[PDB]
Amino acid sequence: GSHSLRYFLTGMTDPGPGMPRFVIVGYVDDKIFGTYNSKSRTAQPIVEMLPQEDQEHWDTQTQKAQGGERDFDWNLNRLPERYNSKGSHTMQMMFGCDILEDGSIRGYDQYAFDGRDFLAFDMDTMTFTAADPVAEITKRRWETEGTYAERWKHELGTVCVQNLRRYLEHGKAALKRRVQPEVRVWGKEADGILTLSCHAHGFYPRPITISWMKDGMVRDQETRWGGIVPNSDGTYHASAAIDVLPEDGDKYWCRVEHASLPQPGLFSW
Amino acid sequence: DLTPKVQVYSRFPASAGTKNVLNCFAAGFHPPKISITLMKDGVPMEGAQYSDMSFNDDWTFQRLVHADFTPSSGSTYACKVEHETLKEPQVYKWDPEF
Ligand SMILES: CCCCCCCCCCCCCCCC(=O)NCC(=O)O
Ligand SMILES: [Cl-]
Ligand code: NA
């Protein structure tokens, strides 16, 4: 068992009508476990995953998130002028930790400004890396103050892993519940060619593979994949298509492998 | 580029007259402000909900919008997307696969 905790933080000068200017979404193994935003000013668990959470934990999460909102607001009111500024701007942060199968730990801590790399912090060497000479200014100020490095060594290597263990335990029912995909194979003709589409609906967990086979042999060369995309209930969706002559339409199988299937499933049109 | 890449799909394999959920997923775009509207025959579907703004590892933003619906073989479903990178709204038609 290798597991991951990740936070995705966005601050926005122009989020759009009725939308919060600062958002946090937290993930455990590609399941959203909680969120914060600047409209509610409240960090809240996803009760379908974390059904019996104590208020005190989330009181703490709320105050830490409100501090993050203040910091993003401070930076959004400074970085545009420093980069030289006139349009809308965004700030982003992703950080978290992994617990590898052998118990060793990894920390991640990366920032972006207007959608471009800005700053990273490496927990194991306690060093920063700046993406450009403007970011370098913040790098040098943070390392010279000598405070950020120790706080985030703690935050990533101690607090994050503790919270990961807590979420893994509290959310074990949701995290371990396998959901088999429902697979639909479809074909539509146009300009004299048959496009065969294999759609896998509603699987969990997230990893899946989909291949197209003819006469039992794989045919990757003319396959298009749509990617793994989310449903709103925490399951996922994935797709694959292939173009073929309408005569050979009965000769193609899409092969679906997923942890919920003891053996890969073969589906035809 | 940084225009939205959009997929429209139903939560369950679709069949006429059976309750379902219609999804519109936009990804790979920047800036994060974006308009995403599910429609039935050009009419905004009621009860639509949006995900909390988030982003991919490469920093590009993404958003899922979904709404309960009962697909009808007589109807066209689509997702209308407006974004700063887009001179005009983009309409993505749902392919029902009935
Ligand atoms: C489950 C999602 C909601 C709860 C999330 C928990 C909140 C943790 C977020 C705090 C991180 C904000 C820090 C970002 C800005 C920054 O670098 N300030 C300097 C510093 O904190 O050292
Ligand atoms: Cl079959
Ligand atoms: Na706000």
Author numbering:
A (entry chain A): 1 to 84, 86 to 270
B (entry chain B): 2 to 99
Quote the passages of the study that discuss this structure, keeping the authors' original sentences:
To further ascertain the ability of the chicken YF1∗7.1 to bind N-myristoyl-Gly ligands, the protein was recombinantly expressed in E. coli and refolded in vitro in the presence of the most abundant N-myristoyl-glycine (C14:0) (m/z 284.223) identified from the mass spectrometry analysis of the YF1∗7.1 elution and of a N-palmitoyl-glycine that contains a longer acyl chain (C16:0). The C14:0 and C16:0 acyl chains of both ligands were located within the A′-pocket in a very similar location to that of the endogenously bound mammalian N-myristoyl-glycine (C14:0) sharing similar contacts with YF1∗7.1. The glycine exhibited slightly different orientations within the binding groove.
As previously described in, the YF1∗7.1 antigen-binding cleft is composed of two distinct pockets that differed in size and shape and are termed A′- and F′-pockets analogous to the established nomenclature originally established for CD1 pockets.
